[PDB]
């Protein structure tokens, strides 16, 4: 949905 | 041993005065006052520790290849899983480096996206209502977790001045009439509390109407006698019934409460007096199993639960008699029942984690019949948010390979036949060049434990490439092999090998392996997580110097637990802000809440098992056992910020000082010559890359792993 950076 | 420039290890005092009394046992505490983060003795440690730690980074000439090869890798657009409301669709979109992701809004299926709005000008608990014309969302005000609710209209982006303080995870739950909504905030600050140092008890369950300001909000719950307990709620699909459900720590298990809002007259209103608590039917009333609400037909209500039932499973209950609980869908004997969907007016998506790889069913919601059945690759399914009423199921798979695609299923009209919505790129990478599989691997008790391997295709098992390893292990946490852009350039640019390891502790084979992996029987954890290294190095992947691992949190546990028992097996070990002293947990910020998974030192048998794995009371020099006289440390980083009131940073700190004074500074001639150092962030996409190039450029240089173009 609101997803953060796949860092 | 990688790294050469020796090293000046700084100045840390002992306070030899502080000794604890724990049932007869005498534990010392010399490092008792870095538990103060604000005295000018802790904030020079930290300032000495940066300086440390800056001079080793400097010899690490990896570092700045691997910046630029995350940005370069994470820089590709990226879809969120679409929902409806009325006849719109919403969903959540990043460029590739922007901070936050912008919120997205169409007109139908096929209709072309809006901007709604863009936060780049920290953000959660996005919420629509039902008929599409508000929308509620969260904005961070501090360092702390606290979240500000404001309300913006649709049609112009224009906001409300409502404003909801003290929100922590609770999103809006919209009546059907479009008047407010359902949250749980925690109350208003009170006398000689502060916004920094306020704790998180006495929540409530409120309703908020549209256009009111938040000391006019209506209470519907709270229990002054049992600060502790918090909450969650929900609506159902029908508009008809609010539930509550009440929760004490970290358990699996919750209370169900019911209130029927069809036989109040005028609405929330009737409350207006308090009369403290709404007339709810407690249908759970105590703390015995887990229950979520998954559909109902008037009073008849399906449940997901693990009563009698440690891989859950369906049950089917009638608020007009409830001594009567009937199972819908039974539970199997292999897999564990993950989620629940009612769908399509008539139908239910199960997820079902069978070997640590989903599987789902469409079954018919009445009778719960069986209709199709799809497994799904080596990766992760999630994010089902459609609802009863919605003919059009979207949900997102990501892999260690694939960095995100959104799947599209037609329910109504072209059924069966799943189509790509969206599929993200990583630019530049050649994804058939590798390859993923699993294994199950052999514990010290002989309890097999399942693994992933990445890896280059057709490699040679002969003992040569570079490996990391990750684990969690605990509160029935599932660790699913995601994407991640790092990982791709540790594989491709360092010739690694990397490891996930679905240890007990974990929730992966239901709550058996979860209760294999807490409180007496911990340590079964790190004996797995050992047992996995081990594997990796008889089977010709890697090598003891050549292995790397990683964790966060109860995984940093993971870490220093498994460095202090078995450091001979390690080249590299990166706990990020790891629990570390296990006596004292409890006492400081929410760390009382984890005690349900690792017991309390306030009770003598939970003590016995802590103290035999607690990190900073178990640092012992290797070299000094008889048989393994060439045995040092692995090179550690340890990771955390110097104010964190999630994982305080003093665990952190304190075993960071024991393993520098037992192993460096408290001898002339230290065998140890491999750097123990924290990354130490002071006070975000640009913060956490600049983060994971430090760790994986002290990582290369620990495992002595050239860079390859």
Request: glycine content about 6%; overall charge negative.
């Amino acid at each position: 949905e609101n997803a953060s950076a796949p860092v | 041993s990688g790294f050469s420039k020796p090293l000046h290890y700084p100045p840390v005092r002992r306070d030899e005065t502080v000794v604890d009394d724990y049932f007869g046992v005498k534990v010392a505490d010399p490092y008792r006052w870095l538990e103060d983060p604000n005295s000018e003795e802790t904030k020079e440690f930290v300032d000495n520790q940066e300086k440390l730690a800056n001079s080793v980074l400097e010899e690490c000439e990896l570092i700045d290849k691997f910046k630029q090869k995350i940005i370069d890798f994470v820089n590709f657009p990226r879809c969120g899983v679409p929902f409806r409301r009325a006849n719109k669709y919403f969903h959540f979109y990043n460029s590739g480096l922007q901070a936050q992701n912008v919120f997205q809004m169409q007109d139908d299926l096929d209709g072309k996206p809006e901007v709604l709005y863009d936060p780049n000008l920290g953000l959660s608990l996005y919420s629509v209502s039902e008929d599409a014309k508000y929308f509620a969302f969260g904005i961070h005000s501090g360092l702390t977790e606290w979240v500000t609710i404001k309300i913006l209209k649709t049609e112009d982006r224009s906001y409300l001045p409502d404003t909801l303080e003290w929100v922590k995870f609770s999103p809006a739950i919209w009546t059907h009439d479009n008047k407010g909504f359902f949250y749980c905030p925690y109350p208003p600050l009170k006398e000689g509390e502060d916004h920094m140092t306020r704790s998180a008890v006495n929540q409530e369950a409120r309703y908020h109407f549209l256009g009111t300001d938040q000391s006019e909000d209506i209470l519907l719950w709270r229990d002054l006698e049992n600060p502790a307990h918090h909450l969650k709620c929900q609506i159902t699909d029908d508009g008809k019934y609010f539930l509550l459900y009440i929760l004490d720590g970290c358990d699996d298990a919750n209370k169900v409460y019911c209130l029927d809002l069809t036989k109040l007259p005028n609405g929330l209103e009737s409350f207006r007096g308090r009369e403290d608590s709404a007339p709810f039917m407690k249908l759970i009333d105590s703390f015995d199993a887990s229950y979520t609400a998954i559909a109902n037909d008037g009073s008849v209500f399906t449940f997901q639960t693990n009563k009698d039932a440690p891989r859950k499973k369906l049950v089917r209950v009638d608020l007009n008699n409830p001594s009567v609980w009937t199972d819908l869908v039974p539970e199997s004997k292999k897999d564990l029942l993950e989620s629940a969907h009612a769908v399509n007016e008539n139908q239910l998506i199960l997820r079902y984690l069978s070997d640590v790889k989903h599987v789902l069913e469409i079954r018919d919601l009445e009778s719960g019949a069986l209709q199709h059945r799809l497994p799904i690759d080596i990766g992760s399914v999630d994010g089902i948010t459609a609802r009863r009423r919605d003919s059009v199921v979207f949900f997102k798979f990501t892999s260690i390979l694939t960095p995100g695609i959104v799947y599209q299923c037609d329910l109504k009209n072209d059924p069966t036949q799943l189509k790509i919505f969206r599929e993200s790129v990583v630019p530049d990478f050649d994804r058939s060049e590798f390859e993923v599989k699993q294994v199950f691997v052999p514990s010290k008790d002989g309890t097999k434990i399942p693994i992933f391997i990445a890896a280059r295709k057709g490699i040679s098992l002969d003992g040569s490439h570079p490996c990391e390893m990750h684990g969690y292990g605990g509160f029935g946490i599932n660790m699913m092999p995601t994407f991640s852009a790092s990982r791709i350039v540790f594989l491709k640019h360092l010739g690694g090998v990397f490891c996930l390891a679905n240890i007990r502790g974990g929730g992966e084979y239901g709550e058996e392996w979860h209760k294999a992996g807490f409180r007496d029987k911990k340590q079964n954890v790190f004996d797995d997580f050992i047992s996995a290294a081990e594997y990796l190095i008889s089977s010709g992947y890697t090598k003891a110097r050549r292995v790397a691992i990683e964790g966060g949190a109860n995984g940093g546990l993971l870490v220093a637990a498994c460095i202090n028992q078995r450091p001979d097996l390690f080249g590299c070990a990166e706990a990020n802000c790891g629990v570390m002293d296990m006596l004292r947990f409890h006492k400081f910020t929410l760390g009382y809440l984890w005690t349900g998974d690792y017991g309390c030192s306030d009770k003598e048998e939970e003590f016995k098992w802590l103290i035999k794995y607690s990190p900073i009371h178990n640092v012992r020099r290797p070299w000094e056992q008889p048989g393994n006289e060439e045995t040092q440390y692995p090179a550690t980083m340890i990771l955390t910020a110097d104010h964190d009131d999630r994982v305080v940073p003093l665990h952190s700190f304190k075993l960071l000082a024991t393993m520098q004074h037992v192993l460096c500074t408290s001898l002339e001639d230290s065998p140890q010559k491999n750097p123990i150092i924290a990354r130490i962030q002071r006070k975000a996409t640009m913060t956490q890359i600049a983060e994971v190039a430090d760790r994986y450029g002290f990582m290369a240089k620990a495992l002595e792993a050239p860079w390859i173009d």
